[PDB]
Design a binder for this molecule. Structure first.
Ligand SMILES: [Mg+2]
Ligand SMILES: [Mg+2]
Ligand SMILES: [Mg+2]
Ligand SMILES: [Mg+2]
Lengths: 90, 90, 78, 79
């Protein structure tokens, strides 16, 4: 799973650039749920029936909105990653 | 950039499992910095000199701590992505 | 609690949880002053819940919110 | 200062999150206690107040009475 493929797969199915607030609201919701999963100690790599409410799920759900926000804000995350590599060597 | 490779690269240069709070704190810091960037409308794909403060950089920095929390919490994001695919299709 | 960092870490988790629930309630437009039967999930409840953990964190971190407000007011006029 | 209310709410919500980010930093760094004026910048005290400030600003624009809400919550908890 390439990171630019994740971003574009998410763009294929969930892209409403006139609803930028929707996506920011959702990011913050998922970070709240993540806080809860970490507080409860729901760590490790869940099977399918362990997934709901796990640190793993909430980590992914935050990632989803990172990517969804990137599409909305015209951000290429893979190209941004690369520029950060340049900064981190200089 | 493969997602597993990103997670694995971050773990090479930043992995302290006895400091789980460090990483959660840092996540919240970046989300606050991301919020500033969206508020200030610093959208688009920046060149190297436009990178500091950009929506692009803050989304990346948030991505970074999602991955680094995944490493700390024993989460495989790519495996978790696959599982979420299954639940979403149902 | 009695070990201070565990208390702080708890209230900080809860702070982020409520800020999440507040985001949802703003998204859904659950504004105004609710009666009791509309309290759950309202913006009002979530704003109170966030306020609650702010205050809880101030107690544990040795913060006087009222004296902090006054210090901020000097900086403001300055 | 703001005339269209969703725009005022959106601003205050962005600022609230910004301030929560800054509070996270002040806690990570252990900047606890009650500071004098020279120690206020970047302290836990400052960020707590700053978060408190936007909670209130957001309550004003959403038509929330925090005193009455607190009272309603107390009735619930007792139940
Ligand atoms: Mg979730
Ligand atoms: Mg940053
Ligand atoms: Mg709540
Ligand atoms: Mg501040």
């Amino acid at each position: 799973m390439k990171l630019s493929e994740l971003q574009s797969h998410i763009k294929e199915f969930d892209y409403a650039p006139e609803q930028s607030e929707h996506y920011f609201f959702k990011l913050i919701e998922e970070v709240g749920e993540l806080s809860e999963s970490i507080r409860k100690g729901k760590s490790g790599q869940p099977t399918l029936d362990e997934l709901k409410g796990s640190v793993a799920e909430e980590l992914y759900d935050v990632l989803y909105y990172v990517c969804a926000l990137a599409n909305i804000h015209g951000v290429n995350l893979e190209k941004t990653h690369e520029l950060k590599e340049v900064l981190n060597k200089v």
